[PDB]
Each structure stands twice: as C-alpha cells, then as structure tokens.
Design a protein around this ligand. Structure first.
Ligand code: MG
Ligand code: ZN
Ligand code: ZN
Lengths: 87, 1270, 109
DNA sequence: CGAACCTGGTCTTGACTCCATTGCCGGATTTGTATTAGACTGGCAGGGTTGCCCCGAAGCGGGCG
DNA sequence: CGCCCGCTTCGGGGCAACCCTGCCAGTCTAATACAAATCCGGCAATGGAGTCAAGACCAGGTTCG
C-alpha cells in the first residue's frame, strides 16, 4: 500500500516545522509575520503582497522590499546549516 | 450506543437487521453496474465507486474541483455533489440497492435446521419449490363465501357433470348409429365373419377409449372440486394446469402467489402468540415424534417471541453495499488493475435488478418475469454464500468466486487469520547456534539484525550526542552504517530484554525473554540449557526475535518471562534447566569411582603409612596435576568449606555444624569434592555417583529450598564443569568399540532348530497358517531376548556405548541391541510380525531383503509421526478454547467439600507400601479436612501445602486416606479460588489471584501428545484421549451393572447374553448384543455365572461408556473414572501430568444440567443450562408460586460445550462460524466482553494476570520520609 | 516482472485539521414525495438547485415554494407509435370493422 | 566647536509586465440510440474419489382403525 | 377395509497445524445515420499581482574646516 504513511517522514515533517519555527523566530516580528503571511504558514491560504500591506498599514512596495531583504537574509549559512539537511 | 468507538464499551449486541435499518445506514442508492471510467480512471457517477455516495477520493477535494482546501470542509458542492472531507471515509460509508422484488436471505432458508421451515412449519423440499418459482402456494382463503358457495357450486358441479354424462351417452348413441351402419355394410354382402365384426370390435374399442377419456376428465373435475373444498393456507399446488383451472374458475374465495412475495405474505398473516401456545399445548400433552418436532419448532418460535424481534426480516427488500475501500480496485505499477471479486457479484445483482425493473415497466408475460425474478434471487443467494445451493458460481479459470461468507469461514477468514494472529513490527528471524559461554539469562544477537531492530532508539541517541544534525541525516547515517553507530548501539542495547520465539509454540515455555549482547556473525546464539524447553536442536532451526517497547512490556519481559525465572515446568514440576546430554556424561565421568586407580588410600603397615590421605583439596589438586592422583580414586581428604552429611554432622559437631572454619575427614574421591564445590555452601556433602536422576533430585531439592538466583547460578556452574569434563572423558565411537556377543551363532542355531520343528509340523498339516505364524513369532521373540541378554552381559562398564546408555544421557538398550546383536522381528504394512526375522546387526551389515523388510516399519512410523502431530495440534486448539474462562479470583472459597485420595494403600502382610503415583495425585494440594488417627493428635492440619515432609509424616504416623481439597469442588461463582487450586507447579508457592490456570492446564495436557505411541479392539494412544474429552460412546463398549445382585450368564449363538438378577423387586436387566469377540471381566478371577456383582461393576472387558456411568453412579464417580482413564494413557509413555491439570477440563465438562420438567419459568424441556443459572431460577420460583423445574446432570464433550457459551464472539471465532452466527442473530444475543478471547479480538486489556482491577489500579508514590530527604 | 506496489487512484495530503473556523454555510431542506426531509449544507454563495437527488435514492424537491416546472420530455416510443408510422387511420379502422364483424358473427351470427 | 555626509532604513508614486481567467467560437471526437425483411425455433458439458462424526430427513416393516 | 408409527437407511455439513516461499489466468455478420454532448485550440475581454525605476525623507554613525 504505497498511499499509506511512511511514518519516519511524518515525524521528520514535525521536527521540520519546529526547526522552521525556531529559525523564523530568530528574526524580528515584522519580518517573520510578513514571511508567514506571504507563504501561508499560520493559515492555508497565502496572503498576497496587497493583503499584507493592508494588514500592515503600508503599500505593497514596502512589503516587497521587506520580502526581498529577508530572502537575502535567510540564505546565510548561519541560518542555512541547520535547514540544509531537510530537503 | 457508541459510533465513534472511543474504546469504552461494555456490550456488543447482534441483531437481525430490517430494511428500515438498511436504508438508514446507507448514504446513497447505487443504481449502475459501473466502477471506473475506462479513459480517465475516475470513479463513475452512480456506480459502485461513486464519490457522491461513498465520499471523496482526494483529501478535501470535491469532484469538480470547486472546493479544494480545508476551509471548505463539511459542505457539499452544489454542482458535483461530493461532500468535501478527508478521503478515509471511503472505508466507512455504505450504500444500498432497492430491489424490484423481494428476496429471501440464504442463511434462514438453507441451514441444517431451515429456520423459515421451522417457523412456518413447511418442509424444505416444499420451501425450495415455493421460493424458487417451482410451485404455487395458497397464501389466504375465505371461509363463509366457501361455506355458502359450497352448496351453490356443488349444484354447479352437478350441472356440469350432468352435461358431461349427456355428452357421454350422446357418444354412446353415435357409436350405436355407426355400429348399425357397420352392421348394414357388413352383414348384407359377402365377407369374412371375423372381418364383418372387425369394424364392430373397432367401434367397441372406440367406445371404450371414448368413455376412458370421459372418465379421465370426470376424475379431473372431481379432483379440482375436492381440492377446492379442502383448500387451506400454507398448501402447495404443483401441476400448473390445475392451479390455472382452479384460479379461472374460483378467482374469489382465496389468493395464491409464488415466490418470496408469497413468503412475505405468509409472514405477514402470522401470530407468534397463538402458534407458541399451541406448541406449548402439544409439548404438554403429546407424545413421541410430534413432541420432538414441537420442541424443535418451539426453539425458534420462542426465540422470535421473547425478544423485540419481527420475523419479517428474513425476507430482504434492500441489500446493503460494503464500502469500496474494503473491496478496492487498486492499479498496479504499469497500469494493470486488480478488482476484489465482490464487484462481479454486485454487478450481476445490479444488472438483473435493472432488467427486472425494465421488464415490469415494459409489460411482459409471466414466464419471462418469473424467470427473471428467480435469476435475481439466485444472484443474491450467490452473493451471500456462493456454493451453498447448487453449483458454485465460477469466474475465469473455473475458480469459484469469493463470496461474503467466505471472508469469515474456515481458516482464511477474518477470525483465524487476521483477528487472533497478526504480523507484527519490530521483529526478526534467523538461524540458531549453541552459545555455551553465555550466562543463563543472556542470548547472542547479530549486530546487523539488532541495528534494524533498534533503529529509532539508536536514531534518537545519535541525534542526542551531536553525531548528526537532525533525524534525516541520522537515518542516512544508519543506512550507510558509519563506524560510530556501533558505539551508540551498545548503549541503546544494554539492559533491554527481548523475546525469543520458537515455532511451533507447544506450551507456556516456548517464549522466554533474554538479555541481548552483540555477537559477530549472523546467527542467534542460544544458551545450551533452554534447548529442552524450546524443543530445538541445531539442525537448522530458526527462531523469531520480537521486541517490547513500553515500560509495562519491558517490566513484563524482565520479571514474568525472564529465562532465569522459569526453571521448573508447569506440567509436572520437574526442572527443565537440568543438565542434558554432554553435561550428564561429563558429571557421570567426574563423579564415578574406579576401584584401584592411581594413588588410592591403602591402609598400610610395616613399610610406610597409608599414603592416601591429604591435608586439603588444594594439595589434592596439585598432586593430580602432577601425575600421581587420578580424579576417580578413593582418597581421604580433610575438608573445610564443604558441609558434611547429616550422619557425620551429628557425629562430630552434633548440633552446631556450621562449616567455614571447621575441619573433618572424608573418604571420597577428588571428583566428588570438585563436584560439591559447585553446589552452594549450605548444601550437605552429597557423595554419590551423579546419575541423571540424582541430578534431577539435587536440582529439585535445591530449587525447593533456596532462592531462585542461587538455583540459576548453580545450574550455570554445573553446565560449565559438565562440558569441561565431557571433553576429557574420552567417549568416542569406533567399530572396534562395538563388540559382538561370542555365542551368537549357537543361540541362533538352537532357536533355528525349533523354528525348523514348527515349520515341519506346519508342513505335515498338523496346524494351520495362523498357529504356525504365532509359534514362529513366539520363538523369535524369545531368541531376541536371549541375544539381548548375552550382549548385555558381555560388555564391560567403561564402553562408550554402555556408558552413554547407563548414565542416562541418551538412548536405551534396544538401540544397542540393534547396533550389535540382532535386529529382531520387523512389522508389516498392516501391523503383523513377519516370521523371517532379521538376524543381522547394523554393525555386520544387513542384506537386501532384510533391508526391504525393515523399510516398511520405518516409513510407517515416519508418516504416523507427522499425522499424529497435526492431530495433537487440533486437540490442543480445542482444549484451550474450552478451558479459557477458568481463572483464579479469590483467595479462599471457604468451602468444606473435598475429594479423597488413596495415598499408599495397606499391605496385606501389614505395613504402608507406598503408592507409585503420589507425585501426580496427592502432592501440592491443600488438606480439605484434618488428618488424625487412633483418637490421637492431628498430624497435618486443615489447609497445608502438603509437600514431601508432611507426606512422610503421614506415612510414618500410619494413616492412609485423607480428604484433600481440589478444583472440582470449588464454590466460587466465576472461576476457581486459590486454596482449591493449591500450590502452583512452576513456582512452588501458592497460586496467585490472577493466573490463567485454564490455559496452563490445556497446554500441559495437549503438549506431549506428539510422543504418544500406539499399538499392534480398544484404542490405546492419542485417539483414546480424543474420544474421552469429546465424550463419545467408545468402540469397545463394555456394559456395566445397574444394580447389586447375581448374574444370569448365557453363551449364545455367536454373541453372548447377560442378565442381572436384582436383590429387590425389580425386573432383571437384560444385556443382549454382546459379541463373542468380547471377553469377560477378571477381578480379584474371571467372571462366573451367578456371581454377585456391585453397582458400578464393569461386566465385560473394554471401555465403559461415560454417559452411563454418570447415570448410574452420579457425578462423583464420573470424575474418578475420567481422571483415571486419561492418566492411564499418559503414564503408559512415562509422562507425568499432575491431576490438577486434568481436573480443570473435567470441571468444564460437567457444568450444565438438562431440563426434564419446565416448572413454570421459561425452561424448555431439553435445553442445557448452567448449574448456577438454573438453580438461581429455582430460587426465584420457590417464591411466587412454588414448583421446581426438575433437572438431571449431564456430561457433554468439549466441542458441544464450547459452542453453547455466553458470548457469541468467542463461539463464532472457534468453529462453525456460519451456524453459530445465524441463530445468535435470531435470539438477539448480546455479548458482554467478559471472557478472555473477546478482549484479544477487540484489542482491549484482558482480565487475567496484570489486567485485572486489583493490579491495574495501583498508586505508586514515594514514602514521606524519603520525600523529605530530597 | 516488477514489484507488487499498489496505489489507490487518489492522493493523500495532510494540512492543518483546524475546526475553529470554516467557511460560512447555509442549510437547504429538501423534500421527496413520500414525506421525507433531508438537509444538505451548501455554502453561502451557492446557487441552490431547485431539485436534488436525495440520500434515499429519489429525486426530492426544495421545500421553498419555487414551483420550477421543468417541462419534462415526451415518453420515447410506444407500440401505438410504431403502428402509426407504418399504417394509416382508415386502414386501422378497416381492420377494426373486420374484427367487429368477426366478433359479431361469433356472438350471434 | 559645529557641520556636512552617508547611509541604515521607511515609505510612497508612477510606469511597466505578465500571466491567470473566463468567454465565445469554430470545429473534432466521443458516446449513445435506432435500424437493418429469404429462412433459421428447447444448452453442451464434465466428472464419480477420505475419514469421521452428527443429525435430520425419506422410506419401509408392522400393527391398528 | 386403508391408515399410520417405530426402525432403518441415506445424505448433507464441518474439520482435518504450525514457522518461510511465493508475485499477472480468455474471444466472432457488421455496419450506416444522426444527434447530443464534450472537449480543445485560439484569440479577446481584461485585471490583478507582481516588478522596477526613481524619489521623498527621518535621522543616527562617520569624517572634515
Ligand atoms: Mg530441529
Ligand atoms: Zn464539485
Ligand atoms: Zn474453591
């Protein structure tokens, strides 16, 4: 039955969620909130740039610059050496 | 009740489901015989896989994709119609079909009692004609319309028959007219006088056949009129033309149909109350055959009347559909598909239902619609049980299809294959080798297998030690097997018990728990002492390794099932960690004594002192390391740390003979000193020759008197010294060490001369063939014993063969006699003895014909072993299921009843000669009464363990009979108490309050059934035991007496006759059919004529019937006869079972009593009910109007006893799954989940051992003083 | 010539099983002819159809008084239609008069 | 001593790009139903195997109204 | 007088152990005519979502006259 649960990748997924929580919480509040709303972590549907600019009281261009700067931040080896083995 | 199954259950009620329940379970009606679209592989709409009916295939997705995530959950897509949810509801939602015409359920039509036939009082031959469109049935009729149209229609009938007779005499008149015409054209011209009457005879025969036709239709009209007068409901009408004539003449006055609709009409017009009251009247007043038939009917009629059930659910108006995930259409790799064999039956039912609906709406003649309805009926019957009625439905390749009942029946069902025994995870399997350096509680383990057993433990541990960043690289590190994972594996292995299985598991000691340790290679190393308990040699046997996970299972394997805690056996109480083959030979060589060896004790004078004494065993060991002392010479050492025996203790030290600084001289060998150093400090000096029975007695005493850890360490030391002295013993086999007797040829010639004399006398016709065969058999048996005697006296004592035999290591003297000497007589394919016998030994080499003669018995025994092993497995399976609900519940039932024990019967000269079977009939029990003698003091009081010192005290004080307490007379409600069961065999103390003594007793009885030989008209092996526990009437049925008095013997023609004269005013009891192959009973001499016999005296010779011996002597003697007869079979092979293992099964036999009077409370005459439930119902009925239901105790076999239990789940899981389940659903029997097998099925915690409420609810807290110290 | 690895035709995802919020939804009450009531929870913004195929197995209508009148199709083919496509009214009337005269001659002659 | 500066961001405005997303529309393919007028009229078909036991039903000897 | 109850015989259903090891079975009147349904290939309405260039600008480290 190939459609069953492999039962080691599920607990690896749980530990991946906790590790990603730690890595995202090592940053500030605006960055982690914009990232989680952008990629849809607290909810199923990912909020778009206009939605996050609405919920943050700004324009979408500031949201996009924040997104670009945080994605430039997260590719550091200090924030990548723990997440590299999860793919 | 519950529907989400929170594992909080107390009942499981089965019931006969109606159409209103069926269309309440179902979610949507399936109406098309399609499964899957052939091109896009999606489930079709309204098919057998429809996503609107059974739920969605994709997680949180509708069919048209309009709602595709969790935020739309619990809603229904307004276009497609699939409720959006998880995809696992395709395993739990059911559908249904709405049939165009009703259909009879096959379980209530075709059984061994047909329940529809017993309910409606119809013959099954008639029922198959009704419900399969073969014969009409009158479902209703009028009374008053028939009453007055009786007169008017008999006037109509007389009018019609008058017109019939008018046409008849009109034919007569036309015959007379044509006859006169023949007269005019015959008797006026020239013709033959016979030819002129040929036309007269032709007209006469024409009138005869005309009145023949008229009389036949007269018979037809009389038949239809008489049948219309005697019309009644439930009457079958075969002969279609008669029914059509009756209908189109008398369309009033009655209705009559054909098929399941007519059966449904009969069940409609039905009252159970007046029917059951008429049946009660018939069983009250009737007699003979009609009383038995009315009882068999009253069973099912009262079953339908008592509960809140309706009989209308035996017909079926709506079939339900099983969910599709239990009959999946899985595709393989590469597009190949696999159905599940129920889709074809469901598709056939769907096809024929749609075609019947179209035929009815189209308007078709009766032939096509009737054939279509019988086709639909046959299809539904084939769906429920293929192969029940008529030919089974075969698929491709002539294989019968797997119907719904075939998922349950037999060995491949859900019960015996997937519910009771499942494949488990965290497991392993490998071959075993002998590991003689391990301690007793250890086991070897290959690291390549323990790395896969302990994978998540080692994953967590090497994540914790920073050898990997996370679990993923740790798993890849385990898969690549990097050189640090072993260093982690030792830490995660240490102090973690594992279970080691061996298949087949005969008894309780087939699973023991060891401590593993890492061992190179790939073989599970085993301790050489658990081989006897496992019954495993090293010829390539494999053993499966399991693994506990939680703390409860780890403590269970550490405490309950550890290998160093099970030394004794639960069957007989003898040790099963005793020294086996090589250890026995080593200790026998180490402790034997040779007269005149190197450096003995010779008491000398003149030349020197004795030169045999020593200061200490250290000096003895130094003088044996130098070549002066042999180990087995009689020396006189002075010992300091070995405790002397009782004689020398009371002689030298008297009372305080504590050793470890004292000194005393001891004339022994060196070897017995080295042996007694193995045994502990408190043990007295043994000073014997260690035969295997002496080692059995030593370990038995040492395990009865000392703690268990001392016994385990002593057994380990004994294994070490036994192996080390087994190498140096010098037991080897060479063909110069197999000596032959010197006088073999003279003995063979002397017996050959007598064989020649017998053959010559047969040649001279003085005796027939059978007598000369018996004479030759006797002569050569005598010759075989003579050659064995001469061979026994020829050998020395230090021959390796005779040392291996006489030291009790292995083998017996018949094998040495066949090695050297004479093979003897060989059996036949039938079992006779060929009078040839083989005179060559296996050392001299046999010849061709002697080898070919030997092969008969060899192949016969080798086939019989495997057949008997399968039979013994079946018997153990029956006994475990029967005795499964006998567990200890209290500490003391406080009864005063108890059986007696013979216990060393009186010698006629006058002593107390000991009975041989005291170890298997009186040890380890509790004294039910006191024991006193000569109006003196009590020797053993009430309630003692009754071990060996108390037995010796009783025998020395000179009493013989005691009343002992046992589980036949235990007065607890559910299961036995604890003092009735007495001492447990495996521990040595009193049995606990949670033991499963029933399964222990069943395993201890059915384990050694493989070793039970058989013989060359009474059964004397395993089928004798099987006919005892099943309580059949035996083959050699010997009658017994029924009264005291003398006999009237008669030697009749080819069979005897025996009549017993009573000592009272009764008729003399006659026993007629007693064949001449039976012989008379011998007692004290053989039976004479006029001999005064007792009540329960066996008249003939053979096997008495247990059913009769219960009726004559009551339930006490039937316990004695059944226990003695089973023990007499098992002790023939030298196998000891304690009698408390047999009394458990006998107690489960004699539970229920029969009903011979109903009383006035709900008890049918002939229904077997429990002794507790029936006697409590007498308590309820002595009040509120007093009459007792009269009952007499019955004895029933084990298949008959286990099926009539209180749970329909344990009974259906045992045997005959259909016939148990079908009448459980009639009576609406509700299980209570109270036994032992049902908790195994539904997966809750069993009520035995550590599962009961005494032990499961223990509060564990630190004490208050240790709380303050932290 | 491969390994027996099966898969049911469908995927299994795993997302957050949260019940604290869902989409808002209505409940429509459908009624069949034989006195049955059924509840089908549609979403809020959903064009509720006037008819529905019920769980019982029969086409139930909606309990609000919509009265859609769907104007169903004709019954497909009759034996009368297959007779009329190959015969005419006067010929069928002629055979009717033929059988009428035959039953008259059988009845009274 | 003050003062430019230079650069973290913080944020907005405005233009640009680009790809989903329905919507017709025209045609392609896919699927379902109706209709064929000389005469034709009750199946091929495949095996029968054990042993033991229990029990329920058919049928026959034997008396009875 | 035919009618019906004890015996006997015949037949149907159930069971007959337990560990590995295994990986897929068949076939014969054949077309037209049409219509409805579904799909698919290709622009055409966007229009929103994102991308980029530039800049307005708040104000704290950083380096000169
Ligand atoms: Mg073996
Ligand atoms: Zn949908
Ligand atoms: Zn008791």
């Amino acid at each position: 039955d190939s459609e069953a649960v492999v039962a080691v990748d599920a607990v690896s997924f749980t530990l991946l969620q906790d590790q990603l929580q730690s890595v995202l919480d090592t940053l500030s509040e605006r960055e982690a909130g914009v990232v989680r709303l952008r990629f849809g972590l607290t909810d199923g549907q990912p909020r778009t740039l206009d939605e996050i600019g609405q919920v943050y009281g700004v324009t979408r261009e500031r949201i996009r610059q924040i997104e670009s700067k945080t994605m430039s931040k997260l590719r550091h080896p200090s924030r990548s050496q723990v997440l590299r083995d999860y793919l | 009740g519950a529907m989400l199954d929170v594992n909080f259950f107390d009942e499981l009620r089965i019931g006969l489901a109606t159409a209103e329940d069926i269309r309440q379970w179902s979610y949507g009606e399936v109406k098309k015989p399609e499964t899957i679209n052939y091109r896009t592989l999606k489930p079709e709409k309204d098919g057998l896989f429809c996503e609107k009916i059974f739920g969605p295939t994709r997680d949180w997705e509708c069919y048209c994709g309009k709602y595709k995530r969790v935020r739309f959950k619990g809603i229904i897509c307004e276009r497609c119609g699939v409720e959006v949810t998880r995809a696992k509801v395709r395993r739990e939602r059911m559908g249904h079909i709405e049939l165009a015409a009703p259909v009879t359920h096959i379980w209530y039509f075709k059984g061994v009692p047909s329940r529809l036939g017993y309910l409606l009082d119809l013959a099954p031959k008639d029922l198959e004609k009704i419900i399969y469109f073969a014969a009409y049935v009158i479902t209703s009729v009028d009374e008053e319309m028939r009453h007055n149209e009786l007169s008017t229609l008999e006037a109509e009938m007389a009018v019609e028959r008058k017109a019939v007779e008018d046409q008849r005499d009109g034919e007569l008149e036309a015959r007379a007219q044509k006859l006169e015409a023949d007269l005019a054209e015959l008797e006026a011209e020239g013709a033959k006088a016979d030819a002129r009457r040929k036309v007269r005879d032709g007209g006469e025969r024409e009138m005869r056949q005309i009145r023949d036709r008229a009389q036949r239709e007269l018979d037809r009209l009389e038949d239809i009129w008489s049948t219309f007068t005697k019309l009644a409901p439930k009457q079958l009408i075969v002969d279609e033309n008669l029914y059509r004539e009756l209908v189109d003449r008398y369309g009033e006055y009655f209705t009559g149909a054909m098929g399941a609709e007519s059966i449904q009409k009969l069940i409609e017009n039905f009252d159970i109350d007046a029917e059951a009251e008429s049946l009660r009247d018939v069983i009250r007043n009737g007699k003979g055959q009609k009383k038995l038939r009315a009882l068999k009917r009253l069973k099912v009629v009262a079953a339908f009347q008592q509960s809140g059930n309706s009989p209308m659910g035996m017909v079926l108006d709506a079939v339900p559909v099983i969910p599709p995930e239990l009959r999946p259409m899985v595709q393989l790799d590469g597009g190949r598909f696999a159905t599940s064999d129920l889709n074809d039956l469901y598709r056939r039912v769907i096809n024929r239902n749609n075609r019947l609906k179209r035929l009815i709406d189209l308007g078709a003649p009766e032939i096509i619609v009737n054939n279509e309805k019988r086709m639909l009926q046959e299809s539904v019957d084939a769906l429920f049980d293929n192969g029940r009625r008529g030919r089974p439905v075969t698929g491709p390749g002539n294989r019968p299809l797997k119907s719904l009942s075939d998922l349950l029946k037999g060995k491949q069902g859900r019960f015996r294959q997937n519910l009771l025994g499942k494949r488990v995870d965290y497991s392993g399997r490998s071959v075993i080798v002998v590991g003689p350096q391990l301690k007793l509680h250890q086991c070897g383990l290959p690291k390549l297998m323990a790395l896969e057993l302990f994978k998540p433990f080692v994953m967590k541990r090497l994540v914790d030690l920073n050898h990997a960043q996370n679990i993923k690289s740790a798993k890849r590190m385990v898969e690549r097997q990097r050189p640090q994972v072993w260093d982690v594996l030792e830490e995660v292995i240490a102090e973690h018990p594992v279970l080691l299985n061996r298949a087949p598991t005969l008894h309780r000691l087939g699973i023991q728990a060891f401590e593993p340790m890492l061992v190179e290679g790939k073989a599970i190393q085993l301790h050489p002492l658990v081989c006897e308990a496992f019954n495993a040699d090293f010829d390539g046997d494999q053993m499966a390794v399991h693994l506990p996970l939680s703390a409860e299972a780890q403590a269970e394997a550490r405490i309950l099932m550890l290998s160093s805690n099970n030394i004794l056996s639960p069957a007989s109480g003898r040790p099963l960690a005793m020294p086996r083959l090589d250890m026995v030979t080593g200790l026998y060589y180490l402790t034997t004594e040779v007269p005149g060896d190197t450096g003995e004790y010779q008491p000398a004078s003149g030349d020197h002192p004795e030169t045999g004494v020593y200061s200490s065993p250290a000096e003895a060991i130094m003088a044996a390391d130098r070549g002066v002392l042999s180990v087995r010479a009689k020396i006189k050492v002075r010992l300091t740390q070995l405790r002397p025996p009782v004689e020398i203790e009371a002689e030298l030290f008297g009372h305080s003979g504590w050793q470890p600084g004292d000194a005393w001289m001891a004339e022994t060998t060196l070897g017995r000193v080295m042996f007694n150093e193995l045994l502990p400090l408190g043990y007295p000096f043994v000073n014997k020759q260690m035969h295997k029975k002496v080692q059995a007695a030593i370990i038995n005493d040492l395990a009865e008197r000392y703690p268990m850890i001392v016994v385990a360490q002593t057994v380990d030391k004994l294994k070490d010294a036994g192996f080390y002295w087994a190498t140096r013993s010098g037991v080897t086999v060479s063909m110069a060490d197999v000596l032959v007797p010197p006088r073999k040829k003279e003995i063979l010639d002397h017996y050959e001369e007598r064989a020649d004399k017998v053959e010559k006398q047969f040649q001279r016709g003085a005796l027939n063939h059978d007598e000369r065969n018996e004479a030759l058999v006797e002569i050569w048996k005598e010759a075989t014993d003579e050659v064995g005697q001469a061979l026994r006296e020829h050998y020395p004592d230090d021959n390796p063969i005779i040392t291996i035999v006489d030291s009790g290591a292995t083998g017996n003297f018949t094998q040495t006699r066949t090695l050297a000497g004479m093979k003897g007589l060989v059996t036949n394919p039938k079992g006779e003895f060929i009078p040839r016998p083989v005179k060559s030994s296996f050392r001299e080499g046999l010849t061709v014909l002697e080898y070919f003669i030997n092969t008969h018995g060899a192949r016969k025994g080798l086939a019989d072993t495997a057949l008997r092993t399968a039979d013994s497995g079946y018997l153990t399976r029956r006994l475990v299921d029967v005795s499964q609900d006998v567990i200890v519940r209290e500490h003391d039932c406080q009864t005063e009843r108890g059986i007696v024990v013979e216990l060393a019967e009186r010698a006629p000269d006058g002593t107390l000669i000991r009975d041989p079977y005291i170890e298997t009939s009186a040890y380890a029990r509790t004294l039910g009464t006191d024991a006193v003698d000569e109006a003196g003091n009590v020797i053993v009081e009430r309630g003692q363990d009754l071990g060996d010192p108390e037995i010796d005290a009783l025998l020395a004080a000179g009493i013989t009979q005691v009343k002992v307490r046992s589980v036949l007379t235990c007065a607890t409600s559910t299961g036995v108490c604890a003092t009735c069961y007495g001492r447990s065999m495996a521990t040595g103390k009193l049995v606990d309050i949670g033991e499963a003594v029933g399964i222990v007793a069943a395993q201890s009885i059915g384990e050694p059934g493989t070793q039970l030989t058989m013989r060359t008209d009474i059964t004397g092996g395993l089928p004798r035991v099987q006919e005892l526990f099943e309580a059949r009437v035996p083959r050699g049925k010997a009658p017994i007496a029924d009264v005291t008095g003398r006999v009237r013997l008669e030697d009749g023609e080819r069979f005897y006759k025996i009549t017993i004269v009573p000592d009272d005013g009764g008729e003399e009891v006659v026993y007629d059919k007693i064949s001449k192959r039976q012989r008379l009973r011998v007692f004290k001499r053989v039976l004479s004529d006029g001999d005064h016999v007792e009540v329960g005296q066996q008249l003939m010779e053979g096997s008495a019937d247990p059913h009769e011996v219960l009726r004559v002597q009551g339930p006490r003697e039937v316990q004695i006869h059944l226990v003695r007869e089973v023990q007499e079979v098992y002790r023939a092979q030298g196998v000891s079972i304690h009698d408390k293992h047999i009394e458990v099964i006998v107690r489960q036999m004699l539970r229920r009593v029969t009903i011979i009077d109903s009383g006035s409370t709900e008890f049918l005459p002939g229904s077997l009910i429990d002794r507790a439930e029936f006697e409590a119902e007498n308590r309820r009925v002595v009040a509120e109007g007093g009459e007792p239901a009269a009952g007499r105790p019955v004895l029933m076999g084990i298949t008959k006893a286990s099926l009539a239990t209180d749970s329909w789940l344990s009974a259906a899981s045992f045997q005959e799954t259909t016939r148990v389940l079908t009448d459980a659903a009639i009576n609406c029997r509700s299980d209570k989940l109270n036994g032992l097998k049902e908790n195994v099925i539904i997966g809750k915690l069993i009520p035995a051992g550590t599962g009961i409420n005494r032990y499961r609810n223990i509060a564990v807290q630190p004490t208050e003083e240790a709380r303050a110290a932290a | 010539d491969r390994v027996l690895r099966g898969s049911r035709l469908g995927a299994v995802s795993y997302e957050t099983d949260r019940n604290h919020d869902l989409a808002p939804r209505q409940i429509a009450r459908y009624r069949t002819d034989n006195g049955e009531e059924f509840e089908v929870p549609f979403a809020d913004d959903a064009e509720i159809p006037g008819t529905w195929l019920c769980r019982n197995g029969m086409e139930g209508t909606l309990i609000e008084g919509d009265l859609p009148e769907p104007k169903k199709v004709k019954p497909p083919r009759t034996h009368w239609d297959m007779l009329l496509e190959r015969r005419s009214i006067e010929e069928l009337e002629e055979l009717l008069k033929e059988r009428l005269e035959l039953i008259r001659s059988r009845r009274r002659g």
